Amino acid sequence: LTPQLKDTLEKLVNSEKVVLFMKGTRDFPMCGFSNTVVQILKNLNVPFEDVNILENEMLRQGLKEYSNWPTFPQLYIGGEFFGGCDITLEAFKTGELQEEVEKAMCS
Amino acid sequence: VTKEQVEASLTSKLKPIHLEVIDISGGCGSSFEVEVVSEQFEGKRLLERHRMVNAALEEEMKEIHALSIKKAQTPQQWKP
């Protein structure tokens, strides 16, 4: 990432209380790990912004470094990287994802 | 990066009661899955816990091509 891309990424992750950078769209995920996170956000009825990194290589590579998480999906909550698919699944199983979404929506 | 370096950097920092590191890159030392259990994770919400693991492997992160932190558990979550 360049400093302009970093500034854009900072604005982008803060634009909605929950942002999901993923393979595909929320109606059409293109990979099972991406679908697992979309279904979790629907189970918890979380409004969120879905962003398709398969059609933006510079975004994909910048986000990999910004989150320090090289694979997708990448879930950001409250303007901060929360986690990837495995972190999100374990958070759904413990209630911790709902706690973070609640924190963001109430902030 | 080798599996042993991933394991040691996480160990010296996080003081884990259990750590698992799996090289998923075919032994290339380039992609890993990680499970950690530590009492250091108590009192911390998962985002803060993820930051601790990322700070622990900060040097490795500059080189690797994937990381999947799967668990960052208290001992009570590890063994309910």
Q: Span from first to last CA of chain B?
A: 34 Å
Give the spatial strand order of the biggest sheet of chain B: 1-2-3
Structural class of chain B: alpha+beta
Kindly provide the name of the CATH class of chain A: Alpha Beta
Which range does the strand content of chain B fall in? 25-35%
Oligomeric organization of the protein chains: heterodimer
The CATH superfamily label of chain B reads: BolA-like
Largest interface: A-B, 21 and 17 residues
Listing every helix as H and every strand as E from the N terminus to the C terminus, the arrangement of chain B reads HEEHEH
| Main beta sheet of chain A | 4 strands, mixed
Supply the number of helical segments of chain A: 5
Q: Tally the helices of chain B.
A: 3
Please outline the major beta sheet of chain B. Answer: 3 strands, mixed
CATH architecture of chain A: 3-Layer(aba) Sandwich
Kindly report the CATH topology of chain B. GMP Synthetase, Chain A, domain 3
Q: How many E-type strands of chain B? A: 3
CATH class of chain B: Alpha Beta
Which bin fits the share of residues in helices of chain A? 40-55%
Radius of gyration of chain A: 13 Å
Just name the CATH architecture of chain B. Answer: 2-Layer Sandwich
Total domain modules of chain A? 1
